[PDB]
RNA sequence: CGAUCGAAAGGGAGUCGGGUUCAGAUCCCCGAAUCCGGAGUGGCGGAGAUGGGCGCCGCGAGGCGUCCAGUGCGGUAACGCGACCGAUCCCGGAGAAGCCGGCGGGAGCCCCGGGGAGAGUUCUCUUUUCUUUGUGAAGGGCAGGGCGCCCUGGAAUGGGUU
């Protein structure tokens, strides 16, 4: 597993060709965005509920989204 | 207290059959078979008892994986000889080469008068 | 008598450039407040010119005769002074002590060392300075 | 320097967590990795590397034309940075090392004081007794441990220290 510190590199890893899926985990005091690539599961950790919702619209349209529960 | 068993068929406590304890997400204690401890390279001078610095201590076939900067020090004889015996060999190589020039000069000094 | 002079050829004993020859361009025999030890700014060579012989082409000689230089401040006990001296110009307005803040000025200090060292090497003088120390 | 054979306890790169059967699980399923080998077109990105002088032009911000350089960079140093050409040849290291004593660190287990959850006793007493109360490999960061590593400086009224 790899942790992406920034938001800008998360968009490139989601826009990779080998990004099989993206999944959103909604727990307390944290929002987790996980992109399943060929080698690693890249995780973006957001502790801002406003930026989580705008990024959720800001995902690329060609990627398959699985909102976890 | 949960007594635990081996996970392989080797039931003897040999050097390759070395384990350590590990706590698991299923809340139980397992054996994890450890790797042997690595050693840093010894200096090529042959006198320093300490091992070299700046080089990772791994098993010899792990050095295939590692990049070059993890395997040497950016210096002449770097990652193979210690800096003390590098500078003490620089001084030696300079000084004996100087003394050979002195002997060559003193040869011609004798041949000039004789 | 003091011998750590701005014409003396020294050997570097420690660091990346260990075993390589340098010329002192500015000695500081009593330490500055930032460097309390006695030290010297030198300007040496990184990559020695290769062995050039006869029965070779003229464009190949210019390829083997390529000197890469370095500019560095050294402690005295990390230097090995020699009896040899070279009378290289090395104007001090470009090779000096606040070179080590701007990397572009360090590029120009290394360039000015390099052109003078190549010019001195192509005259067949100070030939001990341009052969590598075999250790 | 002798073909070849010779260890399911020696050497030997690299897999762990959950779940699953009537009987198999580091092997099946799910989820996370990792080692080795392969590549003409080399799949991409990054590095090599895009710098300076002179002569014009542009008010400048900067732009064309010549002459060159450029197989990386930083730190006094121990050495560090994501790479950082190079063969035949040579040198060295790892693999690769006994037995015993003492001490220190880190785990696991045990121990004590409380919070929960569920049980046991309650004829009398007992805020009581019992069970349970967590996180893999690999990566990154920080404790902690070790150094026969470096720089300054020169110590007797000798100090440091187990
Ligand atoms: Mg074995
Ligand atoms: Mg753990
Ligand atoms: Mg290193
Ligand atoms: Mg055999
Ligand atoms: Mg075997
Ligand atoms: Zn040594």
The span from the CA of B62 to the CA of A2, in Å, is 22
For this entry, resolution in Å reads 2.8
Distance B16 CA to ligand 1 centre (A): 6
Asked if the C-beta of C14 comes within 8 angstroms of chain B's C-beta atoms, the answer is: yes
Say which DSSP state B75 is in: S
**Contact status, residue A68 vs residue A25, Cβ threshold 8 Å:** yes
Exposure class string for C101-123: b at 16+ Cβ within 10 A, else e: eeeebbeebbebbbebbbebbee
**Alpha-carbon span C84 to C69, nearest angstrom:** 19
CA atoms within 13 A on the CB side of C23: 21
Q: Which residues pair with C12 in a beta bridge?
A: C79
Instruction: Indicate which technique resolved this structure.
Output: cryo-EM
Residue count of chain B, please give it.
114
d(CA A36, CA A44): 12
Candidates B29, B93, B37; CA nearest to B60 is: B37
The secondary structure of chain C in percent helix, strand, coil, rounded to multiples of 5, reads: 25, 25, 45
Q: Which residues pair with C8 in a beta bridge?
A: C85
* Residues B75 and C18 sit within 8 Å (Cβ to Cβ): yes
Residue (of C75, C18, C76) closest to B85 by Cα position: C18
From the CA of C75 to the C1' of D71: give the distance in Å.
30
B3 touches strand D (CB under 7 A): no
* Rounded CA separation C4/C133 (Å): 21
Between the alpha carbon of residue B107 and those of residues B98, B101, B111, B113, C53, the distances in Å are 14, 10, 6, 11, 30
Are C133 and B94 in contact by the 8 Å Cβ rule? The answer is yes
Residues 41-60 of A with CB under 7 A from strand D: 41
B101: CA distance to ligand 4 center in Å? 58
β-sheet with A30-36: strand ranges across: A2-4, A41-46, A30-36, A21-27, A65-67
**For residue C11, which residues of chain B lie inside 8 Å, CB to CB?**
90, 94
Cα–Cα dist C46/C22, whole Å? 9
Pairing type for strands A21-27 and A65-67 reads parallel
Rounded Cα distance, C6 and C24, in Å: 5
DSSP E strands, C1-135: 8-12, 21-28, 39-47, 68-75, 79-85
SS3 for B21?
strand
Question: CA nearest B73 in C: which residue?
Answer: C16
Q: Residue B55: CB partners within 8 Å, gap ≥ 6?
A: B40, B41, B70, B71, B72, B73, B79
Chains A and C: 3 or more CB pairs within 8 Å of each other = no
The answer to whether B75 contacts C15, with C-beta atoms less than 8 Å apart, is yes
User: Residues 82-101 of chain C: which lie with beta carbon within 7 Å of strand D?
Assistant: 100
For residues B79 and B54, is the Cβ–Cβ distance under 8 A? yes
CA distance B22 to B32: 7
> Pick from C129, C122, C135, C134: which is nearest to C45 by CA?
C129
Q: What share of chain B is helix, strand, coil (3-state, %, to 5)?
A: 35, 10, 55
Cβ separation B90–C16 shorter than 8 A: no
Give yes or no for CB of B18 within 7 Å of strand D: no
Give the total residue count for chain A.
69
CA nearest A7: which of A62, A46, A63? A46
Please state, as a whole number, how many other Cβ atoms lie within 10 Å of the Cβ of residue A67. Answer: 10
Q: What count of residues does chain C have?
A: 135
DSSP code for B72: -
Q: How many CB atoms lie within 10 A of CB C28?
A: 16
Contacts of B45 (CB under 8 A, 6+ apart): B81, B82, B85, B89
Q: How far apart are the first and last CA of chain A?
A: 21
Return residues 4-63 of B near C (CB < 8 Å): none
The angle at the Cα of B78, spanning B76 to B79, to the nearest 5 degrees, equals: 160
Contact C67, C118 (CB under 8 A): yes
Whole-angstrom Cα distance, residue C45 to residue C48? 7
Decide: C116 and C90 in contact? Cβ < 8 Å. Answer: yes
How many Å separate Cα C122 from the centre of its chain?
16
């Amino acid at each position: 597993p790899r942790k992406i510190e920034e938001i800008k590199d998360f968009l490139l890893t989601a826009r990779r060709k080998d990004a099989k899926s993206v999944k959103i985990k909604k727990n307390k005091d944290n929002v987790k965005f996980k992109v399943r690539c060929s080698r690693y599961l890249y995780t973006l950790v957001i502790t801002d509920k406003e930026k989580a919702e705008k990024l959720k619209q800001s995902l690329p349209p060609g990627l398959a989204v699985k909102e976890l529960k | 207290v949960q007594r635990l068993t081996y996970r392989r068929r080797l039931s003897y406590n040999t050097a390759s059959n070395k384990t350590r304890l590990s706590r698991t997400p299923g809340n139980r204690i397992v054996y994890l078979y450890t790797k042997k401890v690595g050693k840093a390279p010894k200096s090529a001078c042959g006198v320093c008892p300490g091992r070299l610095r700046g080089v990772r201590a791994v098993r010899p076939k792990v050095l295939m994986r590692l990049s070059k900067t993890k395997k040497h020090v950016s210096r002449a004889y770097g990652g193979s000889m210690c800096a003390k015996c590098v500078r003490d060999r620089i001084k030696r190589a300079f000084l004996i080469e100087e003394q050979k020039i002195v002997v060559k000069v003193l040869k011609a000094q004798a041949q000039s008068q004789k | 008598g003091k011998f750590m002079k701005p014409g003396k050829v020294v050997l570097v004993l420690a660091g990346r450039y260990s075993g390589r020859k340098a010329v002192i361009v500015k000695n500081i025999d009593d330490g500055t407040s930032d460097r309390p030890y006695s030290h010297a700014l030198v300007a040496g060579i990184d990559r020695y010119p290769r062995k050039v012989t006869a029965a070779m082409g003229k464009k190949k000689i210019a390829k083997r005769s390529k000197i890469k230089s370095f500019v560095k401040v050294y402690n005295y006990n990390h230097l090995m002074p020699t009896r040899y001296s070279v009378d290289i110009p090395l104007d001090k307005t470009v090779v000096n002590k606040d070179v080590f803040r701007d990397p572009a000025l360090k590029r120009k200090a290394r360039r000015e060392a390099k052109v003078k060292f190549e010019e001195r090497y192509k005259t067949g003088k100070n030939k001990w300075f341009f052969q590598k120390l075999r250790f």
